[PDB]
Ligand binder design. Structure first.
Ligand SMILES: *[C@@H]1O[C@H](CO)[C@@H](O[C@@H]2O[C@H](CO)[C@@H](O)[C@H](O)[C@H]2NC(C)=O)[C@H](O)[C@H]1NC(C)=O
Ligand SMILES: *[C@@H]1O[C@H](CO)[C@@H](O[C@@H]2O[C@H](CO)[C@@H](O)[C@H](O)[C@H]2NC(C)=O)[C@H](O)[C@H]1NC(C)=O
Ligand SMILES: *[C@@H]1O[C@H](CO)[C@@H](O[C@@H]2O[C@H](CO)[C@@H](O)[C@H](O)[C@H]2NC(C)=O)[C@H](O)[C@H]1NC(C)=O
Ligand SMILES: *[C@@H]1O[C@H](CO)[C@@H](O[C@@H]2O[C@H](CO)[C@@H](O)[C@H](O)[C@H]2NC(C)=O)[C@H](O)[C@H]1NC(C)=O
Ligand SMILES: *[C@@H]1O[C@H](CO)[C@@H](O[C@@H]2O[C@H](CO)[C@@H](O)[C@H](O)[C@H]2NC(C)=O)[C@H](O)[C@H]1NC(C)=O
Ligand SMILES: *[C@@H]1O[C@H](CO)[C@@H](O[C@@H]2O[C@H](CO)[C@@H](O)[C@H](O)[C@H]2NC(C)=O)[C@H](O)[C@H]1NC(C)=O
Ligand SMILES: CCCCC/C=C\C/C=C/CCCCCCCC(=O)O
Ligand SMILES: *[C@@H]1O[C@H](CO)[C@@H](O)[C@H](O)[C@H]1NC(C)=O
Ligand SMILES: *[C@@H]1O[C@H](CO)[C@@H](O)[C@H](O)[C@H]1NC(C)=O
Ligand SMILES: *[C@@H]1O[C@H](CO)[C@@H](O)[C@H](O)[C@H]1NC(C)=O
Ligand SMILES: *[C@@H]1O[C@H](CO)[C@@H](O)[C@H](O)[C@H]1NC(C)=O
Ligand SMILES: *[C@@H]1O[C@H](CO)[C@@H](O)[C@H](O)[C@H]1NC(C)=O
Ligand SMILES: *[C@@H]1O[C@H](CO)[C@@H](O)[C@H](O)[C@H]1NC(C)=O
Ligand SMILES: *[C@@H]1O[C@H](CO)[C@@H](O)[C@H](O)[C@H]1NC(C)=O
Ligand SMILES: *[C@@H]1O[C@H](CO)[C@@H](O)[C@H](O)[C@H]1NC(C)=O
Ligand SMILES: *[C@@H]1O[C@H](CO)[C@@H](O)[C@H](O)[C@H]1NC(C)=O
Ligand SMILES: *[C@@H]1O[C@H](CO)[C@@H](O)[C@H](O)[C@H]1NC(C)=O
Ligand SMILES: *[C@@H]1O[C@H](CO)[C@@H](O)[C@H](O)[C@H]1NC(C)=O
Lengths: 420, 441, 196, 49
């Protein structure tokens, strides 16, 4: 509404805006081994897939734009646009070569020979699958038979499980006893990769990057710069990819070496180990404290008083000081003139304090009066008796009923829509 | 305890003595006034979350409307319970109340807050969670090592507003009520305060419960001693244990538990990928972060609505209790109640109010018959073919002589024409006996 | 204002319920028709389910508030019925239950969604000081008033009713005798007229 | 009837609470077992939530 009636109103709590922004990433400068992973002369077979640890490096991944072109690049648990603003805890690259038609099988919750028998992904998988054609490299005339896949297995693989065993598969009932024959197959079969095959039968090199985010110490970081650390000011911080707003202060908490963050029972981050200097910093929200607005009617006047609960006025956390600032027990009142008199309450501030609009015209704040103060002449042998009386008619108003209401669900929720 | 009672068609039991018993009734009056900042509970220090929350302004407005109604209701409850009397009566400097000792319920000017000693005890038994209302930002920033619950509440937009009337003002109101009901009786509740000696007005009350005033004047010392001993017993009982005031501690604990549960409920995903806004915003772009933030907003709004509904129900309960407390203040402090067991067990003589945190404590002074004695009785006596019935009393006999006595105290009187009244002959009435009726000269 | 508050609360609740139809509740729009014209039932069913859940929740919130308000109104109506029984259909001895002062009677008046009681009460007006005694000693006996109080205008002792100054001369029928006149404290000396 | 109303209200509330287990609530089915037998935990977690 454009008009406010006389009274006191609870507005939003006192807000402090961040003054500046900081970024704190680990002090590392080496580039991640993009060449050793993507520019590898000799990839692995899918049944024996190569896992490589990546640690203590900067993941720029703009050096791949010059040469590398990726047919598929799908990221799970993280948006591709945020990869430059994050740090990754324990990073593994799983590399292998498969058929083109089987690249779709490298995904959570898939089925097929590759998914079931060779390489299985979890659905609680945070990471990025990358695949690109390698016909010019992994295919030669007459067939490149160096790349193998498991065709037969008794049961499906568990996620991120590797099976390199070459025992003879018993498809039938009779045992095989370590020799091939009818219903006794060698489990591994070689891809026939020729340069003249269809694109679905051409070799594809696949790299699966598995990592976690914002739960543990990280040594693989994005290419962001690092800003000087500032304390005791509301700032926008970015600690190892975790963004936020608040005040950073020194901490007495002693983190174990494997810990990076600390959390409330509400799971919001309290403490963070600064990745540059190994110290613990407590994070505090920089907005705090109730604020109330005392006003007469907007038709009466446009002046207001502000009661800042939980501040002391005897660099204050107030919107504007001005004059007529004084401390009550309900908080600091700004914009109201204290008076020594006591009247009946008009606008209850609280803690025995009330306010009014008085004449020149201004908002005054006072201690409310409980009533006329008197005594009575008590004595052990004195009585007071009425010699007259009055007949008084008083009025008591009592609600009895309220409006009876009916609701049509189909019409409130699904008004004139049949499918709804 | 399993017992019987010796009923007979001509046997009565009448008390020959009495006791003055002071009982305690504890009633909640108000609860903690609470305000909620939606933007800060749901979307703490996140601007995009606030922009997404902007479309739920109607929901948050109705939440805050309900909570504001609760707060105004609490202030009104306190006003109705304690501000019934418009004038602040003072205690006389002299305490010649006919041997009655009110020093332990009247205030003293030694301590700053002019509270009686019993009021001080009541204050000390129940422990407030807030213990003030000024929790500065520097203080909450300095005790991060401590897991202070008030700071955690206030950092999530959950504030406790102060009551309008402080404990000093409520104590002043109770002191005024004591002064009015001691120096004037029930006259100050019906209009202007009319003074009266305390003994004469306790005798008025004795007449009110059906006992003749001469009993009080003949046993004034005993009655005063019994009242003082009962007050001392109340004092010792309050100083012994704190479980008597559990009704108010339940209110305080319920409010604190509700706020703490509301804080704890911020760890739920509500179907999103995380319970933390910052993790979602640092892991996803606004593109699909808006979906997760919408899920979180819906869930946290629902948590707030649940809290407000519980608070409304608790406010209804507290309002019922406060209405009862106001009725007791009117009918037992400002008057003498003939309703049975409304104010203490026994025949109600009077009552004294005492302020307590979020509540009131009524000391109900009641008259309890003590030492019963058996007598044989008759509905009427035949004298000269007529039937005599007592006016306000009962016929009794100690075996040989027939007397007429008042009902709640053994004060036998010789049968006389003024004691009784005559109606009809003495054959229709059954149980009638034969005796003489003395006619005064 | 107590009845206008009820009317305003009901109207405000209904208007808020109307206003709450503009919320997306996580769907792509707050309008059924826009969703159905922009998407086929294929994925429109999901958005419509979101909207249905949200609007059901709004209705449940409204009904809960109405139930609580109904409980409050029922408490008020029970009080009004008790006052109708005890003050219109009778005379109440309960203090401040029906008006300030000693209740004489009451009149009901209908009002929208409520009742208005005109409580006619008796209020003492003009108090006067007197000196008093619990009893008087006449001939070694103690006389107490039956329904009244002993007062004196300085010289003579009268017996008067309690809520009105109607002094009467002390007489055997005004008082009653019990015991001697030493145990009672505050007792004074005066004569008691015995009628012929 | 005043006491029978209390009994009936309690019984009706409990029976309504039992009946309300047939709602999908936006999921693909109202039965946990059907969801778990038709989908892996992968996307069954969403419907169960
Ligand atoms: C993991 O190892 C166990 C033991 O080798 C496998 O379980 C056996 O599977 C065969 C299948 O014919 C059964 O004959 C055995 O009775 C099973 N033994 C036990 C203890 O379970 C299991 O299949 C293997 N799991 C994977 C994913 O390879
Ligand atoms: C009791 O009070 C009433 C008024 O409250 C008195 O009546 C008034 O008396 C004066 C003087 O005779 C008149 O001028 C007024 O017109 C009267 N007012 C009314 C409403 O009648 C009455 O005299 C007082 N009685 C005593 C004994 O003091
Ligand atoms: C009525 O009961 C009271 C006590 O409840 C009696 O007062 C006691 O009498 C005995 C014997 O004289 C004393 O030892 C006590 O000190 C008294 N106690 C108090 C508090 O005064 C009283 O005697 C009884 N009266 C009758 C007629 O039986
Ligand atoms: C009324 O009771 C109290 C004890 O309960 C009597 O004793 C006084 O107690 C208060 C606080 O405990 C002290 O401040 C006083 O100094 C005590 N007075 C004395 C003489 O010791 C009190 O005396 C009793 N009142 C009367 C008039 O006897
Ligand atoms: C009470 O007194 C009356 C009168 O003395 C008794 O009535 C007499 O009873 C006897 C025997 O029943 C009769 O012979 C008389 O004729 C009665 N006289 C009259 C005037 O009625 C009555 O019996 C006495 N009752 C008791 C219990 O003693
Ligand atoms: C009230 O009257 C009685 C009887 O006249 C007074 O009692 C006498 O008091 C004097 C002095 O105390 C004694 O010399 C007499 O022996 C008493 N006579 C009797 C019969 O007791 C009593 O003093 C008077 N009290 C007052 C306040 O005037
Ligand atoms: C013609 C008879 C079909 C009847 C089967 C009916 C229902 C079962 C559906 C089964 C999946 C179809 C076969 C896909 C094989 C996996 C392909 C892969 O490697 O990814
Ligand atoms: C660089 O890294 C080291 C840790 O090996 C750390 O001590 C140092 O603080 C970092 N440099 C800066 C400017 O923080
Ligand atoms: C990968 O190989 C090509 C040619 O061998 C080269 O141009 C490119 O720089 C290499 N990329 C990286 C990241 O080493
Ligand atoms: C506001 O003040 C004007 C007087 O200028 C008056 O006409 C109007 O009725 C007032 N409105 C309210 C809501 O008080
Ligand atoms: C802080 O406020 C309290 C009253 O709420 C007051 O006692 C105290 O003096 C204030 N602090 C200072 C330094 O004045
Ligand atoms: C109010 O009273 C105090 C002392 O009692 C005095 O210092 C102050 O000047 C007074 N203020 C006003 C506006 O009268
Ligand atoms: C009165 O009589 C009954 C049985 O005759 C007896 O049990 C009871 O104790 C008597 N009352 C008193 C006070 O003795
Ligand atoms: C009954 O009371 C009278 C008067 O006190 C007395 O004369 C009589 O002896 C008493 N009789 C019995 C049995 O107590
Ligand atoms: C009272 O009871 C006794 C025995 O029960 C009986 O003998 C007597 O007749 C009864 N008297 C009256 C008036 O009922
Ligand atoms: C009664 O006496 C007291 C003090 O002696 C006095 O203040 C009061 O005014 C008197 N009452 C009347 C009606 O004059
Ligand atoms: C007291 O009242 C009586 C009777 O009216 C009268 O004779 C006497 O003079 C009055 N005395 C005083 C002091 O008023
Ligand atoms: C009444 O009070 C006065 C002074 O306080 C005193 O002189 C007088 O003795 C007292 N009288 C009685 C009966 O208490």
């Amino acid at each position: 509404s454009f008009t406010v009636e006389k009274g006191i109103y609870q507005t939003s709590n006192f807000r402090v805006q961040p003054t500046e922004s900081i970024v704190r990433f680990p002090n590392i400068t080496n580039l991640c081994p993009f060449g050793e992973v993507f520019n590898a002369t000799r990839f692995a077979s899918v049944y024996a897939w190569n896992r490589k640890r990546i640690s203590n490096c900067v993941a720029d991944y703009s050096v791949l734009y010059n040469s590398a072109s990726f047919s598929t690049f799908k990221c799970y648990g993280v948006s591709p646009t945020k990869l430059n603003d994050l740090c990754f805890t324990n990073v593994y690259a799983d590399s292998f070569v498969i058929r083109g038609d089987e690249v779709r099988q490298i995904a959570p919750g898939q089925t097929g020979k590759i998914a079931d028998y060779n390489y299985k992904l979890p659905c609680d998988f945070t990471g990025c699958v990358i695949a690109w054609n390698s016909n010019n490299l992994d295919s030669k005339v007459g067939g490149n038979y160096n790349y193998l896949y498991r065709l037969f297995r008794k049961s499906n693989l568990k996620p991120f499980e590797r099976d390199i065993s070459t025992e003879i598969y018993q498809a039938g009932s009779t045992p095989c006893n370590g020799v091939e024959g009818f219903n006794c197959y060698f489990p591994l079969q070689s891809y026939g990769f020729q340069p003249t095959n269809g694109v679905g039968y051409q070799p594809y090199r696949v790299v699966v990057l598995s990592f976690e985010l914002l739960h543990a110490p990280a040594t693989v970081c994005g290419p962001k710069k690092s800003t000087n650390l500032v304390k005791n000011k509301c700032v926008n911080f970015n600690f190892n990819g975790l963004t936020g707003t608040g005040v950073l202060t020194e901490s007495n908490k002693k983190f174990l070496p494997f810990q990076q963050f600390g959390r409330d029972i509400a799971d919001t981050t309290d403490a963070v180990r600064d990745p540059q200097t190994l110290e613990i910093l407590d994070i505090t929200p920089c907005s705090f404290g109730g604020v109330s607005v005392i006003t007469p009617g907007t038709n009466t006047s446009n002046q207001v008083a502000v009661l800042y609960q939980d501040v002391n006025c005897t660099t204050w956390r107030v919107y504007s000081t001005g004059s007529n600032v004084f401390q009550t027990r309900a908080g600091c009142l700004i914009g109201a003139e204290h008076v020594n008199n006591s009247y009946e309450c008009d606008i209850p501030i609280g803690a025995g304090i009330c306010a009014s609009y008085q004449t020149s015209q201004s908002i005054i704040a006072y201690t409310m009066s409980l009533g006329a103060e008197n005594s009575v002449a008590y004595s052990n042998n004195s009585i007071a008796i009425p010699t007259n009386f009055t007949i008084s008619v008083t009025t008591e108003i009592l609600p009895v009923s309220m409006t009876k209401t009916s609701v049509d669900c189909t019409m409130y929720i699904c008004g004139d829509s049949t499918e709804c | 305890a399993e017992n019987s009672v010796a009923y007979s068609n001509n046997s009565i039991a009448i008390p020959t003595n009495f006791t003055i018993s002071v009982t305690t009734e504890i009633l909640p009056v108000s609860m903690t006034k609470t305000s909620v900042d939606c933007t800060m509970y749901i979307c703490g220090d996140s601007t995009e979350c606030s922009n997404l929350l902007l479309q739920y302004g109607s929901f948050c407005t109705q939440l805050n409307r309900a909570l504001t109604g609760i707060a105004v209701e609490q202030d009104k409850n306190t006003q109705e319970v304690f501000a019934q009397v418009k004038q602040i009566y003072k205690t006389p400097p002299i305490k010649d109340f006919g041997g009655f000792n009110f020093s332990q319920i009247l205030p003293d000017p030694s301590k700053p807050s002019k509270r009686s000693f019993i009021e001080d005890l009541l204050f000390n038994k129940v422990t407030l969670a807030d213990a003030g209302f000024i929790k500065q930002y520097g203080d909450c920033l300095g005790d991060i090592a401590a897991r202070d619950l008030i700071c955690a509440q206030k950092f999530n937009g959950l504030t406790v507003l102060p009551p309008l009337l402080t404990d000093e003002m409520i104590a002043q109101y109770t002191s005024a009520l004591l002064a009015g009901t001691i120096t004037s009786g029930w006259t100050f509740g019906a209009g202007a305060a009319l003074q009266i000696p305390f003994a004469m007005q306790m005798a008025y009350r004795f007449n009110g419960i059906g006992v003749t005033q001469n009993v009080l004047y003949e046993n004034q010392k005993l009655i005063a001693n019994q009242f003082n001993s009962a007050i001392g017993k109340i004092q010792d009982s309050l100083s012994s244990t704190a479980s008597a005031l559990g009704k108010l501690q339940d209110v305080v604990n319920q409010n604190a538990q509700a706020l703490n549960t509301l804080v704890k409920q911020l760890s739920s995903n509500f179907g999103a990928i995380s319970s933390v806004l910052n993790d979602i915003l640092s892991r996803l772009d606004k593109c699909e972060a808006e979906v997760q933030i919408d899920r979180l907003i819906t869930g946290r709004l629902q948590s707030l609505q649940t809290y407000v509904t519980q608070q409304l129900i608790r406010a209804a309960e507290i309002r019922a209790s406060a209405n009862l407390a106001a009725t007791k203040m009117s009918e037992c402090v400002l008057g003498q109640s003939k309703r049975v067991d409304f104010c203490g067990k026994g025949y109600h003589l009077m009552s004294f109010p005492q302020s307590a945190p979020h509540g009131v404590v009524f000391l109900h002074v009641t008259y309890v018959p003590a030492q019963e004695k058996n007598f044989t009785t008759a509905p009427a006596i035949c004298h000269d073919g007529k039937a005599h019935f007592p006016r306000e009393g009962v016929f009794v006999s100690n075996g040989t002589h027939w007397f007429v006595t008042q009902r709640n105290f053994y004060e036998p009187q010789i049968i006389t024409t003024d004691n009784t009244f005559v109606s009809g002959n003495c054959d229709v009435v059954i149980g009638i006996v034969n005796n003489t009726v003395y006619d005064p000269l």
